[PDB]
């Protein structure tokens, strides 16, 4: 990914994360737990869905037969037809290849972007209360129970509540 | 106490190409090139005329094999390889132009 | 066949599809996906897969 999160500083994906694209995995006195983030997951889904809406569609132009499979047309005009058709085949094959390559590059970079955005959103939330690990983990200095972890996920987390304890723990 | 971010992956991904790499494995992929044919003329909702032994140009002159197609009405006209325009041997001048006209005639 | 509906026809039958491209017949007529040489062009609908 262009941003360097997916297949980047985040070592690998979670096969257990079946409910979402992106999620949180925590460690605290109470144990371990994993939860998907739907806002980031939905943003990625909506954008991929948009590409498919664009690519799966009508070319309303209807083309009639201009040659004949049973009784071949004159050879001069027939050769012009075939040359023109083969030229169009070449253009469209090239177009299709480039479209899919371009869209795939963007799709991968897009997913990588959404992962990065979620990470940075969390980093800003708990400023001066935690430090970046480098594996996509935040080491939190104060005690953070399941209600505290769920507040981070929820986005209600209040850093000023735990700042004195966390800051002083450095 | 720490919280960790991640993304899901699958043991068996699907390979795609990008601008920068061949065979990149992704969670998901959907084919954009149709390969599946239906081996029938799917004619629901259209008045269809299957000419069979009658050649399209025979509908105008009327050799015996075209007796049932002398005044046909159609949205979709189907020519077959076995179709013949003639009984007494011969052929039309500018035959394919005329076929193209009759194919669009209704 | 009056039990299926399609708008793309060729000598071998009917191309029923919503896909943008097809590799079935370069002389298909009606309202058709555009013929391409390639048998397959997979479009990514998800992130890069990075398994453990």
């Amino acid at each position, epitope marked *: 990914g262009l941003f360097g999160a997916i297949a980047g500083f985040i070592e690998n994906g979670w*096969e257990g994360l*079946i409910d979402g694209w992106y999620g949180f995995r925590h460690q605290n006195a109470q144990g371990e737990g994993t939860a998907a983030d739907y806002k980031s997951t*939905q943003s990625a889904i909506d954008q991929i869905t948009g590409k498919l809406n664009r690519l799966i569609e009508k070319t309303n132009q209807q083309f009639e037969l201009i040659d004949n499979e049973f009784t071949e047309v004159e050879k001069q005009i027939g050769n012009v037809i075939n040359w023109t058709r083969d030229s169009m085949t070449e253009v469209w094959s090239y177009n299709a290849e480039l479209l899919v390559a371009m869209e795939n590059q963007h799709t991968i970079d897009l997913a990588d972007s959404e992962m990065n955005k979620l990470y940075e959103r969390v980093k800003r939330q708990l400023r001066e209360n935690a430090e970046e690990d480098g594996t996509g983990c935040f080491e939190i200095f104060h005690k953070c129970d399941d209600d505290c972890m769920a507040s981070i996920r929820n986005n209600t987390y209040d850093h000023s509540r735990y700042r004195e304890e966390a800051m002083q723990n450095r | 106490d720490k919280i960790c971010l991640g993304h*899901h992956a699958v043991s*068996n991904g699907t390979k795609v190409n990008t601008l920068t790499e061949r065979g990149v494995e992704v*969670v998901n992929a959907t084919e954009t090139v149709e390969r599946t044919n239906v081996p029938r003329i799917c004619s629901k909702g259209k008045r269809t005329v299957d000419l069979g032994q009658c050649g399209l140009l025979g509908t105008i002159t009327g050799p015996p094999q075209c007796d049932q197609f002398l005044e046909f009405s159609a949205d979709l006209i189907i020519e077959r390889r076995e179709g013949s325009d003639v009984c007494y041997p011969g052929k039309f001048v500018n035959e394919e132009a005329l076929r193209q006209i009759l194919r669009e005639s209704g | 066949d009056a039990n299926c509906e399609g708008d793309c026809y060729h000598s071998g039958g009917t191309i029923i599809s919503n896909l943008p491209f097809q590799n079935i017949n370069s002389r298909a007529v009606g309202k058709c996906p555009r013929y391409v040489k390639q048998e397959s062009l997979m479009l990514a609908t998800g992130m890069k897969n990075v398994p453990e």
Partner: antibody, heavy 128, light 101 residues
Framework: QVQLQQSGPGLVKPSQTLSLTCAIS??????????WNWIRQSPSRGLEWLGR?????????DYAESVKSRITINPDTSKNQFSLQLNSVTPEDTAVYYC??????????????????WGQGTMVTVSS | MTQSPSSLSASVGDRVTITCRTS??????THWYQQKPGKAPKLLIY???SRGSGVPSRFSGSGSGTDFTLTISSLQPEDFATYYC?????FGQGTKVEIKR
């Protein structure tokens, strides 16, 4: 033609254990493309998800916070079934219990928790 | 998930619209179920706008932000059921559809 068939007693004494089984046919309890759930329904509480199990190169379980302390859902890969075990039942656990497959139906490979097939239900009464 | 109305009567052939109001809006995660008496719920609409397997064309779903709608274009006697929407693991309280005949 997936079919979920449910068994287990519909009468449990208060404080004891409710035990139900869902036997799967047409699909595998350890399939990558399935999630196996329990849901209950009461005229009061309505429809309430209880928990699940699934296999993705290892077994996972998730449970509803309301029953987390009492509940176990285990796969049996010998009989292609999965069970519900609910400990210390109270009259508030009286309900119809359904097993259900999700995650067969997905948006771009993400389980969106669509329950595409359900068992017939087991009516459970907690009473002495 | 919160449904409106709690119940309704409508004549055969009527257009019926049911609404789900959701805490948080995600098109992908909201699905609808139809439950007939003594039976398990059957999934009608999934991902908000997609019809379940075996589901007739008169049923359709729409979504807009946090508001989601199930529509029966022409009501039929056999559609007598209670309808529940669902987002993630929470089920709306249901809408009872009774037929006026």
């Amino acid at each position: 033609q997936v079919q979920l068939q449910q068994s287990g007693p519909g009468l449990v004494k208060p404080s004891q254990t409710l035990s139900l089984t869902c036997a799967i046919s047409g699909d595998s309890v350890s399939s990558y493309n399935a999630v196996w759930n329990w849901i209950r329904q009461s005229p009061s509480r309505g429809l309430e998800w209880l928990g699940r199990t699934y296999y993705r190169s290892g077994w996972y379980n998730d449970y509803a916070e309301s029953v987390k302390s009492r509940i176990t859902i285990n796969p049996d890969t010998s009989k292609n079934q999965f069970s519900l075990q609910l400990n210390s039942v109270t009259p508030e656990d009286t309900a119809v219990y359904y097993c259900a497959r999700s995650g067969h139906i997905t948006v771009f490979g993400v389980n969106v928790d669509a329950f595409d097939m359900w068992g017939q239900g087991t009516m459970v009464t907690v009473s002495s | 998930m919160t449904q409106s109305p709690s119940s309704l009567s409508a004549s055969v052939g009527d257009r019926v619209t049911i609404t789900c109001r959701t805490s948080q809006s995600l098109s992908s995660y909201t699905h609808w179920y139809q439950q007939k008496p003594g039976k398990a719920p059957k999934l009608l609409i999934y991902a908000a706008s997609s019809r379940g397997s075996g589901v007739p064309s008169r049923f359709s779903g729409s979504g807009s932000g946090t508001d989601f709608t199930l529509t029966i274009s022409s009501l039929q006697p056999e559609d007598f059921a209670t309808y529940y929407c669902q987002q993630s693991r929470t089920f709306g309280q249901g809408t009872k559809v009774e037929i006026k005949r």
